[PDB]
Amino acid sequence: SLQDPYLNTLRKERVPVSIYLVNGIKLQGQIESFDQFVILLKNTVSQMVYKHAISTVVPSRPVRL
Amino acid sequence: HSLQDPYLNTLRKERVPVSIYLVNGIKLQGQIESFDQFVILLKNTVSQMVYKHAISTVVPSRPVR
Amino acid sequence: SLQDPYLNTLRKERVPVSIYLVNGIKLQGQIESFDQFVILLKNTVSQMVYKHAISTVVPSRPVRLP
Amino acid sequence: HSLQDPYLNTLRKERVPVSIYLVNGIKLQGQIESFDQFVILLKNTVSQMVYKHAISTVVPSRPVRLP
Amino acid sequence: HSLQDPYLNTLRKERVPVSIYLVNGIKLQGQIESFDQFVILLKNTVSQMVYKHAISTVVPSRPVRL
Amino acid sequence: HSLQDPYLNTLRKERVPVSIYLVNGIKLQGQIESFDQFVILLKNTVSQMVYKHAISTVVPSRPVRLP
Amino acid sequence: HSLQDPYLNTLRKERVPVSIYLVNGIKLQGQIESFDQFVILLKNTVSQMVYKHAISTVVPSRPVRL
Amino acid sequence: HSLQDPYLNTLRKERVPVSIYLVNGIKLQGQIESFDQFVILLKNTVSQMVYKHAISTVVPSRPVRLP
Amino acid sequence: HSLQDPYLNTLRKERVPVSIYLVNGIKLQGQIESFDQFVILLKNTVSQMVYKHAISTVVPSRPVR
Amino acid sequence: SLQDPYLNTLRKERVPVSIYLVNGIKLQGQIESFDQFVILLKNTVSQMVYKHAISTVVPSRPVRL
Amino acid sequence: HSLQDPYLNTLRKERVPVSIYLVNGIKLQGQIESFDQFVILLKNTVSQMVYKHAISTVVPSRPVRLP
Amino acid sequence: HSLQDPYLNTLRKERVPVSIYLVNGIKLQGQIESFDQFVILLKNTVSQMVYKHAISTVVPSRPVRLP
Amino acid sequence: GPAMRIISVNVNGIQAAAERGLLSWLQAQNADVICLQDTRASAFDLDDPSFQLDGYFLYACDAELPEQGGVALYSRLQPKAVISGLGFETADRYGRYLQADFDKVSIATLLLPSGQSGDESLNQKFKFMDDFTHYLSKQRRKRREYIYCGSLYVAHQKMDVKNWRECQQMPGFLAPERAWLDEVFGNLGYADALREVSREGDQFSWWPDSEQAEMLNLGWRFDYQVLTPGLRRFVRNAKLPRQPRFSQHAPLIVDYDWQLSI
Amino acid sequence: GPAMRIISVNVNGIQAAAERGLLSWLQAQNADVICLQDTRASAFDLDDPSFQLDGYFLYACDAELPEQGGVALYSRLQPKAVISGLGFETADRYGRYLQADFDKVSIATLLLPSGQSGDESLNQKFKFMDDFTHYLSKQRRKRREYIYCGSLYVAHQKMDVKNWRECQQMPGFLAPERAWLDEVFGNLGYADALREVSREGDQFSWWPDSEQAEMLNLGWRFDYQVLTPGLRRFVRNAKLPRQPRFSQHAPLIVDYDWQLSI
RNA sequence: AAAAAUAACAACAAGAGG
RNA sequence: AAAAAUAACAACAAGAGG
């Protein structure tokens, strides 16, 4: 797969990313953990976003696998 | 399931007043009474069920865990 | 699961509920029956509402499931 | 599928004019010719194949019910 | 799967100019050249791929038999 | 998943400036690094990660043929 | 004063309910009990003394003709 | 005021619908019935007296000329 | 002249608390101690001379005459 | 006096003057008439403007007496 | 005139500082140095000439007596 | 006119730039050509006629004496 | 409780509509204020007893050339004032505005050029739209409620027209025209009296004179009752009778909770 | 007809006002929604039966430090929703906002920092004013009418503070503070429920603790019920009783011609 | 805290909140 | 077509209409 290595690479070295939801609402923060269904991002509060409502996940700094 | 279930249960038994966002931008707010694989029922004044496919984001008001 | 017992308690007690869809449109009625996928309610005529398009099911009276 | 399929079959056989409200609020009014477990076909002037995952409600014009 | 697959195929091989409506209301229009379980390839000046979970309806220009 | 992976793989081998439209009408240009069962990467100044359940359409700016 | 005095005497002797609009816009409802060359005595509760140089218009509620 | 009253008399006898601007900005659109040296009665729906020290300007709706 | 001078004298002799509303809507409540033409002296903690051409209304607080 | 020759010279020259009222309303147009109490101005329709509501009269061009 | 001019003369020769109010609500402060029938000269750091038709009230700072 | 016109002639002879505040509370600066008992002329770039019943106050920019 | 019925029918000539049964219809409706747009008659023509409804006071603002405009108003109660014209040329000399000032509310009636004859009509239509936008920008400072019973000849949304994809270029559904209603109803706070109670579709008010369009209900919604925001909650029943119409336009019957006073 | 009464009182601590008899007073007023500002207690303190008025549901939003804020609300009918906070932290962690969502109206209650202690409270007050202006700019697009029962700690007009020439420099009558109410009531179109009915002077809601200010009536108006524009006409009468008092503030009592539903 | 519902914007690089 | 009334802006080069 691709999602499980990419999100692990994104969370282990803590890139400040922006997640765009399906309605256009954008969310700044860093990913701490992720299961098969949700993603827990935390800038100042432990926030949980369901992955079925995520349009895009964009890192701010360039990342490689 | 490895992240979603220890998170909603921690917000449930500690009774943190959370704010649940929907996929159409509607902000609901209350306490989580219980949760299935598919639903979360919250109480503000009247207990109501919300399907998890309509939930975009679950935000607690105070930091947890 | 409380997907089925809560809807069974709304169905057997004949509680007038309000169903909010995923676009904000509410539908007031009484849950006549439901399977895994649909919910039939009747305010004026019988109506089949799909569970993948609802957001919230709220009752008018306070009901806790057994 | 144990309860929606005899409902849609009753909507077919008595030929009641139905109105399908989509998940964005758009009303498509007509009558159901035939339904799969993934799609429904409604005929007003052409045969529309409407997907079942884009439908919010299916409501008939006159009150009917299944035996 | 038992009824949408003859319908898309008889829109394909008769090359009927179809109008396909997205779930956000966007009206695309072209011709159906191929379809798997998951996508439909709409043929026009550019040949694009439309996912089936974003499609509300597929209408034909002329009424066809099935 | 029978025919969509030759299409995206044809876009991946000979890299096309592909425009992907989202389910809310958002247009995104870029080039596909790789794709998965559920998700697609895009190349720009920032490298986007877009899930397939939010993608409405995928179009190339150049007319590409499918073998 | 060919119409200044007879119009006010007709409003006074018929004791009509009248409305005086002042030069700043203030609406004073009452009844004309007496008037000099300079003043007009409006009255509803505790009477008044209204100077003519600050009065803009005087509107009777009933149609009044000389 | 030898020039003030070929004008108001002409607007009275021809019955031109006029517009009287007061000194506080209030526009009273009406029709002159009679006038003193000090007051002017106008008739929109009910006849009212207007003191001339409160009148700023008097315009007619259509152009008129003096005898 | 013939009617404001018996009115202000009646306001002055019985010493009723009057309220003088000026042209610009500003009210001055007090008592009338003396008057002639062109002025009215309004009495308070300090006594002020109000010009009569800047007065809209003079209304007493008690019904008199 | 001074008002009569000024308004006569301003009338016979037909200067497109601006009259500013006491409330700040600006009026444009040349002067047709004046007697003692009132002034008839004209740009499109003959406007009758009372003198006790006029603050200033401003010529557009410089005017000599 | 029988009571206005002794009041202003008393406010003049005892040099009482006045807060004089205009009809548009403007409070000027100074002291009265001269007055005719029509204007009042209000002495301060500049010597003005206030018009009596623009004055609403004249208020002294301290209570003064009238003969 | 026992005390006003000496003050105005003192303003006229010395050609002091004065400021006239109107009853609208607005100011007009400039010298004075001439005056009468109804209007006052002002010298800015434009030569104005200002009615004396709309004038609230007249002030000099710097103090002038009155003999 | 208290009630107030207002009818804002556009007649396309009061004589041609009165020959078809207008005045016998308006008497049996129990309206308080009837607003007539595009009356196509002078002020002397409405002074005849043929148009005088019993119980109603009639006030009219005619054009200079009476075929180019004209506005009429029937009122149950006598108004405090009647004001004709808006202050600019295309409203004044064409007679496209009348206002009846009552106690707390004032009921206005407004006609617009259709822009369907030629390009000069569309140009004076845009002139009228900009000048009336400048009028509405000034009238929001006052302490009086307004009811503009207008025939705007401009449709607002996709719901208000039939087959909007074919109607994008015809005058009545233009993008600067619908952006003007997005400015008036959206940002200026003004309300639509028909949208506050029924968001049901297929409620049209104008039809072309071809019978194929009216038998297939290819209609338009051109006439509105624009409300100042203080009136939003006073609306009970706003309807457009499709069948008993007397012109190309349909009447607009709106029932309010207001109590109209002098 | 239909009626609703709203009482809003800034208590300066609900314990110190309940020892002064506030809860015995509020029961005999027949109010529908009572709004309590700067209640100075946590959520556990209002859970005691000492504050539970019979017939009323009590909802509270406390601060994290309970001496620095707090907001309470009693309601006759049970609301559809109760929302605490409005998005920015200076009311969120200080507990200066609560909202009761009913059927067609939501009644909100709002506390502000007075800015009377020091300059940091004045800067916090300007931050709150700018953030609440940005909130009111966003809330103009919704269809729900609001009543904000606001302890605003600003006097709007020269009528609203006793001697205004000496008051120009105190927090409560500052020029950026009164310009904010000029922008809220003027250009954003919001009503003031007192000035919709009564525009007589010498109505004030707050006085200093000095008895010379009490007896000379050296008061200020700092309390408002602020209405979305569709509510301008739903205001029968509004009053500010001086005599029964429990705080530096008098109660603000308003009657509405409106019928509160679930 | 939500328009009993826009027969349908060849498409808003994206309203930390419709 | 008009705030039953701002104990009072040391002062709007001026709201073709408060």
PDB file of C-alpha atoms in Angstrom, chain G residues 4-58:
ATOM      1  CA  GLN G   4     -53.213  82.374   9.688  1.00  0.00           C
ATOM      2  CA  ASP G   5     -55.966  83.363  12.139  1.00  0.00           C
ATOM      3  CA  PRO G   6     -59.232  81.891  10.639  1.00  0.00           C
ATOM      4  CA  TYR G   7     -57.705  78.417  10.182  1.00  0.00           C
ATOM      5  CA  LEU G   8     -56.496  78.370  13.790  1.00  0.00           C
ATOM      6  CA  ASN G   9     -59.848  79.711  15.046  1.00  0.00           C
ATOM      7  CA  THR G  10     -61.586  76.941  13.099  1.00  0.00           C
ATOM      8  CA  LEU G  11     -59.251  74.374  14.677  1.00  0.00           C
ATOM      9  CA  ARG G  12     -59.803  75.951  18.114  1.00  0.00           C
ATOM     10  CA  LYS G  13     -63.590  76.390  18.209  1.00  0.00           C
ATOM     11  CA  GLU G  14     -64.186  72.900  16.808  1.00  0.00           C
ATOM     12  CA  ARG G  15     -61.568  71.621  19.375  1.00  0.00           C
ATOM     13  CA  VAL G  16     -60.171  69.002  16.998  1.00  0.00           C
ATOM     14  CA  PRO G  17     -57.314  66.601  17.831  1.00  0.00           C
ATOM     15  CA  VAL G  18     -54.351  68.182  16.056  1.00  0.00           C
ATOM     16  CA  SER G  19     -50.662  67.308  15.544  1.00  0.00           C
ATOM     17  CA  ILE G  20     -47.944  69.976  15.529  1.00  0.00           C
ATOM     18  CA  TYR G  21     -44.653  69.048  13.856  1.00  0.00           C
ATOM     19  CA  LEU G  22     -41.817  71.244  15.115  1.00  0.00           C
ATOM     20  CA  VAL G  23     -38.780  72.512  13.203  1.00  0.00           C
ATOM     21  CA  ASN G  24     -36.592  69.653  14.464  1.00  0.00           C
ATOM     22  CA  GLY G  25     -39.158  66.920  13.740  1.00  0.00           C
ATOM     23  CA  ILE G  26     -40.824  66.465  17.146  1.00  0.00           C
ATOM     24  CA  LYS G  27     -44.495  65.460  16.867  1.00  0.00           C
ATOM     25  CA  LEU G  28     -46.770  66.965  19.539  1.00  0.00           C
ATOM     26  CA  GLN G  29     -50.346  65.656  19.646  1.00  0.00           C
ATOM     27  CA  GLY G  30     -52.975  67.740  21.406  1.00  0.00           C
ATOM     28  CA  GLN G  31     -55.725  70.356  21.113  1.00  0.00           C
ATOM     29  CA  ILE G  32     -55.447  74.084  20.415  1.00  0.00           C
ATOM     30  CA  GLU G  33     -57.106  75.880  23.326  1.00  0.00           C
ATOM     31  CA  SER G  34     -55.865  79.426  22.642  1.00  0.00           C
ATOM     32  CA  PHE G  35     -53.379  81.203  20.399  1.00  0.00           C
ATOM     33  CA  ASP G  36     -51.834  84.674  20.215  1.00  0.00           C
ATOM     34  CA  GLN G  37     -49.750  86.235  17.418  1.00  0.00           C
ATOM     35  CA  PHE G  38     -46.680  84.482  18.883  1.00  0.00           C
ATOM     36  CA  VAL G  39     -47.838  81.400  20.827  1.00  0.00           C
ATOM     37  CA  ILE G  40     -50.192  78.416  20.515  1.00  0.00           C
ATOM     38  CA  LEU G  41     -51.583  76.554  23.547  1.00  0.00           C
ATOM     39  CA  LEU G  42     -51.592  72.840  22.760  1.00  0.00           C
ATOM     40  CA  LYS G  43     -53.154  70.676  25.507  1.00  0.00           C
ATOM     41  CA  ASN G  44     -53.563  67.001  26.279  1.00  0.00           C
ATOM     42  CA  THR G  45     -52.444  66.253  29.879  1.00  0.00           C
ATOM     43  CA  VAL G  46     -50.543  69.254  31.257  1.00  0.00           C
ATOM     44  CA  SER G  47     -51.249  71.812  28.730  1.00  0.00           C
ATOM     45  CA  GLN G  48     -48.170  73.434  26.983  1.00  0.00           C
ATOM     46  CA  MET G  49     -46.984  76.707  25.543  1.00  0.00           C
ATOM     47  CA  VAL G  50     -45.685  76.217  22.004  1.00  0.00           C
ATOM     48  CA  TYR G  51     -43.873  79.063  20.261  1.00  0.00           C
ATOM     49  CA  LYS G  52     -44.828  79.650  16.628  1.00  0.00           C
ATOM     50  CA  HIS G  53     -41.257  80.257  15.441  1.00  0.00           C
ATOM     51  CA  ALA G  54     -40.336  76.614  16.139  1.00  0.00           C
ATOM     52  CA  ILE G  55     -43.481  75.120  14.560  1.00  0.00           C
ATOM     53  CA  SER G  56     -43.015  73.669  11.081  1.00  0.00           C
ATOM     54  CA  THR G  57     -46.420  72.174  10.214  1.00  0.00           C
ATOM     55  CA  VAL G  58     -49.844  71.793  11.846  1.00  0.00           C
TER      56      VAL G  58
END
